[PDB]
Structures are given as C-alpha cells and as structure tokens.
Design an enzyme around this catalytic site. Structure first.
Site, short mmCIF file in Angstrom:
data_model
loop_
_atom_site.label_atom_id
_atom_site.label_comp_id
_atom_site.label_asym_id
_atom_site.label_seq_id
_atom_site.Cartn_x
_atom_site.Cartn_y
_atom_site.Cartn_z
N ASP B 320 0.88 -1.19 0.00
CA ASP B 320 0.00 0.00 0.00
C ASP B 320 0.91 1.24 0.00
O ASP B 320 1.97 1.25 0.68
CB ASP B 320 -0.92 0.03 1.21
N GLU B 367 0.54 -0.72 -5.10
CA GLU B 367 -0.72 0.01 -4.97
C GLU B 367 -0.39 1.41 -5.50
O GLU B 367 0.50 2.04 -4.93
CB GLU B 367 -1.26 0.06 -3.55
N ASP B 420 -11.99 -1.15 -0.06
CA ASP B 420 -12.23 0.30 0.14
C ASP B 420 -13.39 0.85 -0.71
O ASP B 420 -13.81 2.01 -0.42
CB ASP B 420 -10.99 1.12 -0.19
#
Ligand SMILES: [Ca+2]
Ligand SMILES: [Ca+2]
Lengths: 523, 523
Positions: B320, B367, B420
C-alpha cells in the site's frame, strides 16, 4: 532528483506522468485508392481522394492505410496485384487523376473518355484507356516552360529520386525495345549495363525515358497533394511494402550484387515458405533473395534507399513477411516446388540499426501472421515494432489465440480483417456454427444481426494503439466486395466503392464510427 | 544462431515463441478470512477456509487475496482494522480456529462457546470471548511433550522467526505490565532496552512471553495448513502490507535507528499526504518515517526481514502507498494537520535490488491509486511491478482514464473494486445518472439489471494478467456488505458471509465465474 531523505521541490506533486505522443491511440480505414469511385474505370488521386479524406476527418479517423502504390505486374494472372509490382520505388501511373491533369492544363476536357463501367476495375482494359492520356499529359509537360517544367527538373535531379528513377526509366525503355520475358535474355551490352550501350539507349529511347520520368513526376505531385491534404486533416498514411522485389525489375538489374545471383545473373535460390502440415508442399514465391552478408558490408545502402523512398510516400508502413529479417526460406531456383529448401539466417537488428542511423526513427509495422518462430518475436520486440492482430483469425482455436482481444498488447495494430480476408459479413456467412457460437459468446452474447458492429467495436475497444477497419465493413458489404482471395489468380484487386455510394452521403457511417472512437479513446 | 546468410538447423520451424509462466492469466477472489461464516463470532483458519478453497478451485480461480493478517489495533476507533496493526510480522490470534485446536487436543469440545450471532464481526466483544480460549490452548501446548511441543521449539528457535517474534513477545509483555498509551512513556530501562531490565522482564513475565510465542506458533501452523491446501488446489495467496508501521510496536521500539526519531525516541516527522485540492487540508496518518539513508548503509536489513516474513505467509503481495518508495510526504510531528509538510526523496530501486539479492524474485503488486508523479511510474516500471486498475474509478472522467479497460496493460492487476470501494450493486445504487449512462455505453449498451455481470466480465476480459473480484460481488450483495468506507471510524472490517450462505450451495456462482474464466483465457 536530490539525495535519499532530502526535500524535493515544493512543486513535486506537479510532475504528473508523461503520455508519449508515439503511444496515442488512433483509428484508420483500409482503402486502396483504385477502390475510389468515379467515371474512369479506376480510383485515382483526384477529387475522390479529397472527399475520402474529408469523410475520414468527419469520422474522427487519424490514419489511412493503402496497399503498395507500385505499378502492378501486367505479365501473368497477377492482374492488378500491388504485391507483384514492376518496380519497388515507382508509383502506379493508373492512379494519376485525369481531372487533376485538366486543372493543370496538361489535358483538355474534350480528351477525357466518356464515363466507363463503374462497378469493378477491369485490369484487362484500363491500361489501354488511361495510358495514352497519361502519355499525352507527360508530353505536354515536357514541351511546357512554366512552374511545372521547373518542378519536373528539380524532381528529376533530386539525388534521392534519381537514385531509383534513372535505373527504372532505362530498365522500362530497354524492356519496351527488347521485349523478352526477362532481362536474363537481354543482349549482353544491355544485360550487363555497358556504359556505352546505356548512352546509346538514351539517344535512341530519349522520348520513352523522358516521358517515363515525367509520368513519375505527375504521380509524385498528385500523391504529395493527397498526403499534404491528409496531414491538414490530422490523417497519417500507412503504406505497405513486400520484403522481396521481383527479378524482372530495375531493382535487381541495376543492383545485381545486392542479390544472390550466379555469374550469368540467374537467381541461385528463390523465396517461398515450406510446408507447415499444409497440402504436402508449401509456397514457391520465386523472388530473388538478398545477399544480406554483402549488404552488411556497405551499411545496407540498398535497403536504406528503399526506406527513404517509402518515407517520401508514407508516414508509416507495414513490411510484409517481416519474419524474413530473422530467418528466410530459400528454394534452389531449379526446383518447381517449395518442399526442398532450407531456413537461412536473416540480417536481424543491424539492418534496423543502419536504417535508424541513416534515416532516423520510422513507424514500421511488422506483418507477423501465420507460424513464426521465437527469433522473429525477439527481433520485432528488439526494434519496438508493433505486430498485427486480426479478429477474423481469433475464434477458431482456444483462449490462447493471440488475435483474441484479451491477448492484445498496446504496441500492436488490430484489424477486423485485411485485404486478404473476406468482409466481416462474408466471413460470417461461411463461418461454421461452432465458431459462430464461440464468436457470439466472446463478444458478450451480442446478436448475429449485429456481428459487424461487434467486430468493429472489438477492434476499436482493443488496447492496441492502432485499429484499422476496411472500408467494405463500414459500408456493410459482403463477399462480392472482398479485395483478395490468397490462393487465387483472377477476380482480385478490382473492388470499387459503387458509383451510387458517395462520401457526402455517408454522414451516418462517419457518426457511428466517431461515437465509438470517442468511447474507446481514439479521437 | 549461425552467421547471416548461413543455414539454420532443419528443425528451425519448431522453435515456437516462449510463453513465460510469470505472464499466465489468472483470476482471484478478495475475501478476508474474518468474513468466513461460522459459529464463533469471526471467520477463522478452520473448516470454512478449506471449504472456501474448494469453492475457489471449483470456480477455476488460481488466486486468493486477503488483507494484512496482523493483529489489528484495539486502541482507538480503528476497531478491527488490518491496516492499523499492533505488529508488522505477527498473525491475528482471532483468526485461530477453535475447531482445529479441538482436533489437536489443545481444547475440549465442552470448552467451545455456544453459537454466537453470525451476521457481523463485533470487534467490541470477540476478543473477550476467543482470547481466553486461545490462551488455554497455548498453555496446554506449553505443558505438552509430543510432536506439537517439538514443532513449537523448532519455530521459536528458527532464526527468521526469532528475528521478530522475541521482540514482539517482550514488547507485548512490557505493554501489558506498564500499560501506558505508548512506549515513549515506559520506564527508562524498558524504553531503552537495558540488557538487565529485559532479562528481568523474562523472569517476571515468563508465562506471558511463552504464551504469546505459543499463540504465534498456533497461528503459523494453521496458516501453513491453509496455504499448503491452497497450493494443492493450484491457488496462490496474495497478501497486503502497509508501507509504514505504527509507532507503538516492537517494529519501532526494538529497531529505533531504522526510524527518524529524536534522542528521546519521539518521531521528528510523521506520514501523511498533502492537499490535492481536497478539503483544504490533506491526511495526517501519523506513522513514524523510515531513516532510508541509515537503511541503505546496512543493505536495508530491516526491510529485507519484513519481506522474508511476508514471503513466509504469501505467494505474492501488494504494498500500500508504493509511491512512498519514490517520494513520501513528511509532516513535523508537532503539527495537528498535514498542510505543513514536504515531499522527501524515497529510497528507489536500490531497496528492491537489496531485496532481490537477499530473498530472490517476489511478485510485489504496487498500490498506485490517486495522484502519483512520473517518478513513481518510473520506479514501478524499473522493477517490473504491476500496478492496479479499479473499474469503479473508470467512468467519471474522460476516455484517457487509466482504469478504463482500453487503457489496461498486461503487467497489471484489475479489480471491479477493492475492500475500500462499495460492492458493484452499492456503487451502482448511488452513481449519478450521467456516469451510469457512460458505464452502460462503455460496456456495449448492456442493461442496468446486469451491471454486476458487466463489471465482472469487464475485469475478466481485461488484458491485465490478474483479475480480482470481491466475494461480495459474486454473492450479489449491496452496500450493507461493504468492507471499508476510507473516511470513517466505525462499522468497518465487520462484513461476514451470512450464516445461511454455505460454500456447498454456491455451485451456480462457481460455474458462472468458471465459464467466463474459460472464455477470457484465465483457466
Ligand atoms: Ca513485354
Ligand atoms: Ca493498554
């Protein structure tokens, strides 16, 4: 950038990722100019070329693809074939617009023929009608003393142009006078280009040679007007070149040491492809092969000149049988079939290094259909050339078929079909039921009545940066409109847009294409 | 290959192009194991994990994606968040299967709780129910003298395991005893790891430390059984790691010189992202930042150990905020908002060079959502890491949106949506009419009732080599099943597959997915 852990500038977040203009997504139409409508038996570089480019602009297309623009072979059943040319560098004088020559004052309106049958090119009659008119125009140009005379002189003297044109004109003049099947049988002083014999050719065939050069100038000027107009509309022209040239040409006769010939000028080995579990024997093309070892020694000067002339005509171009640059099939010239042959090592990347060094960057498309070997893929990727996807080949094997859209890549050209395939509608009509079921399932279970829209959208919605649609599919045509069948000798290269269809009546087709180019980011 | 112009071997045409197994097209399902159904208040690594993997195998999926498996933060409103972990390396002991511990003889059937409410994870009650049972099992293991005792001893002594586990156990023991909000306020001999104070911790907190290590062993053994079963079914597990770790952890306390702290151990600068014309101020994440300059000097040893443990759990994994490796936003730790900050230079490719040298090749997914700069793209491409496409972000701008399928590339992971995003059906329900019209036009004018099928097929039919679908979309669920909303503090990470839904009743869903994986070459 500064050292690890140090501050970037305050404006760091403004450094947004770069879109290379070379990667721009584009759409184009495949339409050979012989296919343009009009009243003179064949499409030309006149009024219809400009109406076509206006229609392409209205459609949001930024590319136009043509077949080779060379003078087709007249001397078999290759009738009108752009891929059996008489010369690698000359333009087909049958593409010269009689109306543009009237505008120039080189022809009188009264000299134009009465309207000819409009459906199909008749390659057996069109030369006898147009050739005499193109000759009359060239003769009027040669006797004129204006602007066009001065341009003819600058053209004839240009060192790029003269590097192929002088040889092509003298070749044609000798072919016309001697009239053997091949230059192999010419009288020794012409076969072997004795300096004195060539000087004598120019004295006895002066008018023939001057007219041939003037015809090539008339082609160049018409083609440059078309290309300039295309560029004015945001349209690039993609051309096409066979890897090999024909034996009976200036290309070979004036450049013998570029080819693998014996000391009498006869090919030692000729081109083809071997069997690939296809009808026992393969294909005997019969072109002479390049002496790639000799070529490497002079920096591939012959190939560099061929590319220079291609960039003079085209923004970008396909090379047919690109695989021949990695490995080529060579058949002993005495053999009547392709079976007995050997794979030879092609020149590879150094040919492209020399072209880059001499001519700068070119968008070359690699024709890479059929069985190709790993070395062909490695060569293509090494020079960053796009290959091809053809949707009409995608649905008859398994999900690993490279022509299926989920297998496409960004650096690629996707076609529904080429001039060698049937139209989408013709292909559909003869497709087996199982393959039809496979196609419909792949394209999200669309209805069979919308197969044309489904394949066109399949091409436009590909990640491939160039999508090309044949004009026959935009017009919704069937098998009667196919340009070429690969196995045949007759009926080919003759399709024209019907006289009843005009570019100013195709606004609906232009909008339909423009809307999907917008959706899939090609506008 | 031989010299230019020479013969290749007779078998040249057999050298067919190589498909690299690394490029294989695959499909997977995003499902965090907390979301598995069952009677104990939370999904676990027991019977449902194996039934899930059987369903994935029946569906033709070859990947399973999970969120981070770390123990979530209990110590705010980060309730149950996998991205606010207490440790970078430990497993969440709440994922330990009570049924598998019965099979082991570490728990009695009579000790299991009566069936708990099945709809949603209640993070406020689940620890008080399961923690005492996991402790009872660990205590029985520590007093046992069989095979499992010997495996516990080999685990505890393994030098990869002990490199994080000893520090994590002593940290937890001191946190439990001292019970300040942060280690910043620990008594100086524990804060600063005086060798004698740590020896005293092990004497006074021996049982706590031994039990913590035994719990981590029970996690490891259950997770390894799940991963071995997955590999038996042709399924790889993709994990996930935040780029940053939390201040209050063994990661920081035992490795202080890896972070930018002052001489009292307080962060000098903390993580966030600046405004991007978003609500005036940006985001203050507040993690400590890496001393990337100090890290480079020891060959990025801390990062290499973090990757080793990640490869111990996962076949492949996402990082991430991958952009942080090229440039990261640093906020002075006294600031209460992100506005006042500076972009600092990240470590770049040398971090990945050191990982490659120490650990060999890893499939790391970058990401790369939101605004990223050119240097981030150049870093990602430099290590050949795939980025992300998320179809729920594709339809609200123009045709140049990178999430649209015609903009995907082969080395990429495509999602309908992540944990998300809302489910496809929830997202559709709140989508503005104009964007809805845009989506339907893009996906070949499909009907609004088939939006879920249209996005799933849009992912599976992408050129992206990995396509991932959230289990909530396979089950046809709406906004009540969303895993996380990015802006909130409550209601998140709690979705479970309903008790009424069992993997053995989802054959129809498995076939529906399997058929499109077949069509689009992911099987
Ligand atoms: Ca003749
Ligand atoms: Ca506490």
């Amino acid at each position: 950038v500064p050292a690890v852990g140090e501050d970037f500038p305050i404006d760091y977040a403004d450094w947004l990722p770069k879109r290379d203009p070379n990667d721009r997504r584009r759409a184009g139409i495949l339409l050979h100019p012989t296919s343009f409508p009009g009243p003179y038996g064949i499409g030309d570089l006149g009024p219809q070329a400009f109406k076509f480019l206006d229609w392409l602009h209205l459609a949001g297309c930024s590319l136009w693809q043509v077949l080779p623009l060379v003078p087709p072979g007249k001397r078999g059943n290759e009738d009108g074939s752009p891929y059996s040319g008489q010369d690698a560098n000359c333009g087909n004088t049958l593409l010269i617009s009689l109306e543009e020559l009237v505008d120039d004052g080189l022809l009188k309106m009264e000299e134009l023929p009465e309207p000819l049958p409009t459906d199909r090119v008749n390659y057996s009659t069109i030369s006898e009608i147009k050739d005499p008119l193109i000759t009359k125009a060239a003769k009027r140009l040669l006797s004129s003393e204006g602007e066009l005379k001065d341009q003819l002189e600058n053209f004839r003297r240009d060192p790029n142009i003269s590097s192929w044109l002088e040889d092509a004109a003298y070749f044609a003049a000798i072919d016309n006078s001697v009239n053997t099947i091949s230059w192999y049988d010419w009288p020794e002083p012409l076969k072997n280009r004795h300096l004195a014999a060539l000087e004598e050719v120019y004295q006895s065939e002066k008018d023939f040679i001057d007219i041939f050069i003037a015809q090539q100038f008339l082609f160049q000027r018409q083609w440059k007007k078309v290309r300039d107009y295309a560029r004015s509309k945001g349209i690039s022209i993609m051309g096409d070149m066979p890897i090999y040239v024909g034996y009976h040409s200036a290309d070979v006769w004036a450049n013998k040491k570029q080819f693998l010939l014996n000391r009498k000028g006869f090919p030692l080995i000729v081109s083809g492809v071997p069997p690939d579990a296809f009808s026992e024997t393969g294909q005997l093309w019969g072109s002479p092969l390049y002496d790639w070892k000799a070529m490497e020694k002079d920096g591939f000067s012959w190939w560099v000149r061929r590319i220079q002339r291609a960039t003079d005509l085209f923004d970008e171009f396909r090379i047919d049988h690109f695989r021949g640059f990695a490995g080529f099939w060579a058949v002993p010239s005495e053999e009547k079939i392709a079976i007995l042959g050997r794979w030879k090592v092609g020149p590879g990347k150094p040919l492209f290094d020399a072209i880059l060094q001499a001519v700068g960057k070119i968008n070359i498309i690699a024709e890479d259909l059929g069985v190709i070997t790993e070395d062909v893929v490695q060569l293509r990727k090494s020079i960053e050339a796009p290959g091809m996807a053809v949707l009409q080949f995608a649905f008859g094997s398994d999900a690993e078929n490279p022509h299926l859209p989920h297998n496409h890549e960004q650096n690629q050209v996707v076609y529904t079909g080429t001039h060698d395939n049937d139209t989408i509608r013709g292909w559909w009509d003869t497709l087996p039921q199982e393959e039809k079921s496979n196609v419909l399932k792949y394209l999200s279970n669309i209805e069979e009545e919308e197969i044309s829209r489904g394949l066109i959208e399949g091409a436009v919605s590909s990640v491939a940066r160039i999508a090309i649609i044949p004009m026959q599919d935009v017009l919704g045509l069937g098998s009667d409109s196919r340009m070429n069948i690969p196995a045949t000798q007759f009926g080919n290269w003759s399709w024209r847009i019907p006289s009843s269809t005009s570019f100013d009546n195709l606004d609906a087709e232009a909008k339909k294409l423009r809307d999907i180019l917008a959706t899939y980011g090609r506008l």
